[PDB]
Symmetry: C2
Subunit: 361 residues, 2 copies
């Protein structure tokens, strides 16, 4: 029902994947380092309250009638709902407060990729807060109240709601399906694999940026799907695009979902074949994305897709090589990357006296 | 995660307990052939019988001929019914087609202009709607997508709205949810058990004038933006004064418990509850069934929030209209703006496996 907030790492990376997401990117409006550190301490205090299911500050009610309540109160009577709050720092943060020389080399700018159609307004950001929870209202209340506490020092640049499984009805051992109808997450880094997390996910001291030890690097891509076009493709076209069948999710030529793929039996530009670590010099990612459906655009079409989130030890050796190899993905016919951001996710809050970003500031 | 029965005298999705998630879509008709449109309705009813039971539509999501697109798009495979309901409604503009003019109900009244209205015509109106409600948002999206797919060439989606969480209740024995202003929403609604109150206030009767609508209801949808920056800097007392209930318990002002009956004379003259209460409105009573929404930022550094308000009633002219007219002086108006609007006639229920949506009209 709750996920511990303190740790060597921030929660919400290797911890069990919750049903819902509210991702927000913030821009910083203050030039004052001290004022920003002050806000980081205030946010951390609020995150401790929120992730334990408590109201922020002195509560949603019961205070002085002539003061506004410390907490906006729409999460009253709800449970912690496995809420995790994960903060990250964008490269543009490091142009402020004199931090230019503290930017990790692993926090690399993404190249432009063939087919990119990035909306400037829904890309970038000085920092982000990833709020995951099984109840969407818990997640929204967290973002709503952190933005309020930070008003004057940060504004919300863009925000994305997402959903995965609904746990109260779907088995825990069942792979969820993306909105193309295919199981998603079969061959992924699991939070139980401590050795693969150390190798592929967590920043280490010898990687070159000490304040980032125990952190990770996050890539966010908002990927629209062309739903109506996908849905007119033959069942055989859809399965050819991925290299797995739609019903079971088994790699072509095998019968069970978790059978290891034979890549030579897949089409040369199949998505699994091009994404697999064997085709990328061993490059392996922790995917932790969520589906989205925002409504319908001006042409009647479903505004829906995958809010892709990948964690890795170094952007230069994780996301970049794999996405580069997708240049000829048969999937590119049906998707468009329309938003993008990268963030350095600092190490965990170690105890009650620690705070978000203490190793950097 | 069980199924809600699809057949009945009335459509499910109204007196039914309010499910966690909403996906509501409005459709414009693009065919002149009434025979084709009836065929659509029959095919949509068949799909909905599968969908509400947790089955894939048509011949399924896989296993068919490799070279054909599958009948069902597949993303609900292995999910339970999740209490899915599908409720269809007919807009006033529909009756300009297929020779239906003489059949448009009197109780399908167009809404007048209300003060403060800033309505977007792109997210308003619609020849018909489908309200998909479920506890699993993938289940709801899958149902809308597959209905639209089946209707390609005969209908198109005009506008849609997802509600990420409910702000209404038809089950007073369960916890009342809160809206994004932080107040419980749904305390004094109509309960799906109050059969006599639903007959009097919700279900259309034969005597009312339009025989094909007997057993149906009428739907008012209003998309309402909330000024959360303005709200969130108001004092606790201002917020409580605006509604007439306290924030914590949600009790009428002066009383201890959420479900104690309000004493209206103790509320401000412009309090929302005081002005909305049936006693202030000649007995006018509504079934509220709305959902909260957030659609990103506003581009100005703030979250965008609102309430997708849905009211069912026996007659728009004696339900939503008089109550909304009485909210002209509502203190809540300082914090909200109506920006989308639509009315629909919700026909009677699909009686059995041989019946179909709209059969009593067509
Ligand atoms: C709409 C966008 C995408 C969809 C629908 C999608 C879907 C899938 C599916 C169905 C699988 C097979 C099941 C699984 O192992 O999870 C898969 C595998 C994978 N995908 Fe994607 N994908 C998308 C974009 C991306 C992107 C942008 C990347 C990285 C840049 C990526 C990297 C991977 C990786 C590493 C695997 C595991 C391959 C393996 O080791 O077998 N995917 N994806
Ligand atoms: C964002 C817009 C609105 C918000 C936040 C809101 C909120 C509330 C709240 C907090 C209550 C008290 C608890 C309850 O009994 O449900 C309430 C009651 C009520 N509201 Fe609203 N409301 C909104 C719009 C409307 C509109 C547009 C109407 C009708 C046109 C309406 C009609 C009513 C009615 C009939 C009651 C029950 C009063 C009673 O019988 O005691 N509300 N509303």
């Amino acid at each position: 029902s709750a996920v511990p907030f303190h740790g060597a790492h921030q929660a919400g990376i290797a911890t069990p994947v919750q049903d819902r997401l509210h991702f927000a990117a913030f821009d910083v409006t203050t030039e004052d380092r001290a004022a920003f550190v002050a806000l980081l301490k205030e946010w951390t205090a609020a995150a401790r309250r929120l992730t334990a299911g408590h109201a922020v500050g002195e509560g949603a009610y019961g205070g002085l009638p002539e003061a506004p309540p410390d907490d906006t109160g729409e999460a009253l009577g709800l449970k912690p709902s496995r809420l995790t709050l994960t903060i990250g720092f964008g490269p543009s943060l490091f142009t402020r407060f004199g931090l230019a020389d503290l930017r990790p080399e692993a926090l690399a700018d993404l190249p432009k990729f063939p087919g990119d159609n990035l909306d400037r307004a829904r890309s970038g950001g000085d920092l982000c807060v990833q709020a995951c929870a099984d109840d969407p209202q818990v997640a929204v209340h967290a973002i709503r109240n952190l933005a309020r506490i930070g008003f004057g020092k940060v504004v919300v640049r863009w925000s994305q709601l997402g959903f995965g499984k609904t746990s109260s009805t779907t088995p825990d051992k069942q792979t969820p399906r993306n909105l193309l109808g295919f199981k998603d997450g079969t061959r992924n880094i699991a939070g139980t694999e401590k050795d693969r997390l150390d190798r592929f996910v967590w920043a280490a001291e010898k990687d070159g940026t000490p304040w980032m030890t125990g952190g990770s690097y996050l890539v966010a891509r908002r990927i629209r799907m062309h739903i109506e076009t996908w849905d007119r493709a033959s069942l055989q076209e859809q399965e050819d695009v991925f290299g797995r069948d739609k019903g079971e999710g088994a790699p072509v030529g095998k019968a069970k979902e978790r059978d290891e793929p034979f890549l030579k039996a897949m089409k040369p530009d199949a998505h699994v074949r091009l994404a697999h670590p064997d085709s990328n010099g061993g490059a392996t990612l922790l995917r932790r994305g969520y589906s989205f459906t925002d409504g319908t655009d001006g042409l009647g079409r479903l505004d829906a897709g995958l809010f892709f989130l990948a964690y890795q030890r170094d952007i230069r050796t994780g996301f970049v090589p794999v996405q580069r190899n997708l240049a000829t993905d048969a999937l590119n016919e049906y998707i468009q990357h329309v938003g993008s951001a990268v963030f350095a996710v600092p190490p965990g809050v170690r105890d009650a006296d620690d705070w978000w970003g203490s190793t950097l500031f």
